[PDB]
Enzyme design. Structure first.
Site, PDB file in Angstrom:
ATOM      1  N   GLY A 149       0.529  -1.037   0.059  1.00 41.64           N
ATOM      2  CA  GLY A 149       0.292   0.087   0.246  1.00 41.64           C
ATOM      3  C   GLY A 149       0.907   0.801   0.288  1.00 41.64           C
ATOM      4  N   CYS A 150       0.563   2.143   0.541  1.00 45.70           N
ATOM      5  CA  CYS A 150       0.686   3.642   0.046  1.00 45.70           C
ATOM      6  C   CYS A 150       1.762   4.310   1.452  1.00 45.70           C
ATOM      7  CB  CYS A 150      -0.592   4.642   0.308  1.00 45.70           C
ATOM      8  SG  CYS A 150      -1.620   4.973  -1.536  1.00 45.70           S
ATOM      9  N   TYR A 151       2.099   3.390   2.146  1.00 48.09           N
ATOM     10  CA  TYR A 151       3.406   3.581   3.007  1.00 48.09           C
ATOM     11  C   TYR A 151       4.454   2.786   2.428  1.00 48.09           C
ATOM     12  CZ  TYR A 151       1.848  -0.918   4.921  1.00 48.09           C
ATOM     13  OH  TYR A 151       2.253  -2.367   4.876  1.00 48.09           O
ATOM     14  N   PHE A 359       2.052   6.505   3.997  1.00 43.35           N
ATOM     15  CA  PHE A 359       1.151   6.675   4.970  1.00 43.35           C
ATOM     16  C   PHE A 359       0.517   5.279   4.072  1.00 43.35           C
ATOM     17  CE2 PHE A 359       1.300  11.446   4.709  1.00 43.35           C
ATOM     18  CZ  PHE A 359       1.907  11.061   6.145  1.00 43.35           C
TER      19      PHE A 359
END
Lengths: 375, 376
Positions: A149-151, A359
């Site tokens: 994901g985005c992190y 994040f």
């Protein structure tokens, strides 16, 4: 001798979608024009996204060929994966070649390969594919991360730092290749947050070369990886989720995300910078994953950042949208480019220390302390 | 100071399936009793598997409730993942607790968490679930690996080694939790690949604690991670492939897999041991991923290993089947146990140097050089 980013390369699909025309496009190709209220909601999501354009592998043609992808919920993992698996590799290859070029060393000197893909699970994976595509040493040490994901931009740096610092001469190629073909789907009146994904997620790949003890006669450091950390935001359970289903990867995002993240940033900053005797958050250059404009506005307000501190971060969001794990590297890339153009002393807008934030699902926050390099 | 394995814990589903009765069980619960001919091939497959028993999450009850899983190919990924996601975490938690106990330190001292699962993709993942389940530090540095496959035992050690050695005091918890619920499927006359997995793959989780510079007053080293390598076997493209489909995870292996791997072993050995001035493969203790009985036979043959070299490896295969990435740890665990019982001088069957091999998609071979630790 700190692990150092010595090259950054990026790539995006050739199909450009201007946000101003996306609502109409999206509702038309997903046969949702009859949902007037849903369209207004989506239109507003796009208008408030602060995204001007995005690059997507998905096209109207592909949706016509795969109606089950255009549907909000239709069995379509197989057709999505067929494209996803090839797309992440080709996009990653383009980015990797650009990174390798900037790096200045022959690819045969790459000892490790870290590949990060939101989706596209395959065995062997994208890391194997890239090794073959780039004709890297078959003994290159690989790490393949699917569905982080985005992190993840922070995650790959956290990994690269330890590899580079514990292996003399190690040269790590990182490739974060993000394609939303596995996530792209029609809107849902029952799951209003699902379409947030089609309003903000764009495609893109970023590759970076990381190594410790730079050979200054050929390599050119950009940023140093000082320290890395990862944490789970308190009481954030279930705020950001993604499930790999028969209809592809789902998108779940609760309205609390902006406040949960922004309200916890100072803790991440304090944990990372107190050891360095740094407390002025405005004295740092910032590279934050632009999950959304709300996150950026709230972080800026709550952390007490000057209005333009996240200028580069916002610019990347505007020009490419949210490219998941690859985004922070586009920001990192643009930051050193703008710093040079603005005649600043360092790759970090003239500042010495910086922070990179990832994040994502958890809610997870990856905090990377960076040190700029003179321009 | 080398990263050191300080604890190993394992777990398996409570459902034990004796291989001798699996052919009947399998074709019965999948309503394939009418496929007499195909049943014969499977029975033969199981008989030569060299597996006596396996522990699986799947049960007759589960298949009755989910006939779409029993079918060879049917949209069933959703029902599979629901169980897979929960299973890997629960099984992983059990193994982790056992490893933590042996380790002897408070779980609050765990600084890094590496989780490896063949299947069960979820966001956040199993690493997040385990962090919550084990009540680990919220700031534990996690690494989550989904869909790597059978070479991952070496992959996680390769990762743990660099983490532990580059971070003073770092204590890494590794959890390889493997469940085959995502790849379980009925037999098909027009298919002959997925049937092999139904006969050799078992469920199980293994957890280990890795750290450099052990506090010998509390921590007790088992094996040292000397070096790690990963390589792609020449001319092996497409030999081992796995795809996550709407019908779950499906594997396809060329019949040449055993030969490709076995013929490449001496190369991996030479690359890893020449720097240590070692050339006698029988002077090392062996931990090899038991992908299947053939791989073990061919490695033994081509490498020239004495019969006892892969004894523990074969025993684990016999007692648990192929548990993907967790397997090498079951073997590592049993090896130091047997060594102790046999009153041997080191955790590695009395030998000083050893090698751990992971084999998987690529074909990828992970080679980890190990050093045993003295045993009083």
């Amino acid at each position: 001798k700190l692990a150092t980013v010595m090259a950054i390369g990026t790539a995006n699909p050739p199909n450009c979608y201007y946000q101003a025309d996306f609502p109409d496009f999206y509702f038309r190709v997903t046969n949702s024009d009859h949902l007037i209220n849903l369209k207004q909601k989506f239109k507003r999501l796009c208008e408030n996204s602060r995204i001007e354009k995005r690059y997507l592998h998905v096209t109207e043609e592909i949706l016509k060929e795969n109606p089950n992808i255009a549907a909000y919920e239709a069995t379509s993992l197989n057709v999505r994966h067929k494209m996803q698996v090839k797309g992440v590799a080709e996009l990653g290859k383009e980015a990797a070649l650009k990174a390798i070029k900037e790096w200045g060393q022959p690819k045969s000197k790459i000892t490790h390969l870290i590949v990060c893909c939101l989706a596209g699970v395959d065995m062997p994976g994208a890391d194997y594919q890239l090794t073959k595509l780039l004709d890297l040493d078959p003994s290159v040490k690989r790490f393949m991360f699917y569905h982080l994901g985005c992190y993840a931009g922070g995650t790959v740096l956290r990994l690269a730092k330890d590899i580079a610092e514990n292996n003399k001469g190690a040269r790590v190629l990182i490739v974060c290749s993000e394609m939303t073909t596995t996530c792209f789907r029609g809107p849902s009146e029952t799951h209003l947050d699902s379409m947030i994904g089609q309003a903000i997620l764009g495609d893109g790949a970023a590759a970076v070369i990381v190594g410790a003890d730079p050979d200054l006669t050929v390599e050119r450091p950009i940023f140093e990886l000082v320290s890395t950390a990862q944490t789970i935001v308190p009481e954030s359970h279930g705020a950001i989720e993604g499930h790999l289903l028969e209809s592809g990867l789902s998108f779940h995002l609760y309205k609390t995300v902006p406040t949960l993240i922004s309200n916890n940033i100072k803790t991440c900053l304090s944990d990372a910078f107190t050891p360095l005797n740094i407390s002025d958050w405005n004295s740092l250059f910032w590279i934050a994953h632009p999950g959304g404009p709300a996150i950026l506005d709230q972080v800026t307000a709550k952390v007490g950042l000057e209005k333009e501190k996240l200028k580069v971060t916002r610019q990347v969001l505007k020009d490419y949208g949210n490219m998941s794990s690859a985004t922070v590297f586009f920001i990192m890339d643009e930051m050193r480019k703008k710093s040079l153009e603005n005649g600043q002393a360092t790759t970090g807008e003239g500042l010495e220390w910086g922070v990179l934030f990832g994040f994502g699902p958890g809610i997870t926050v990856e905090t990377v302390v960076l040190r700029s390099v003179p321009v």
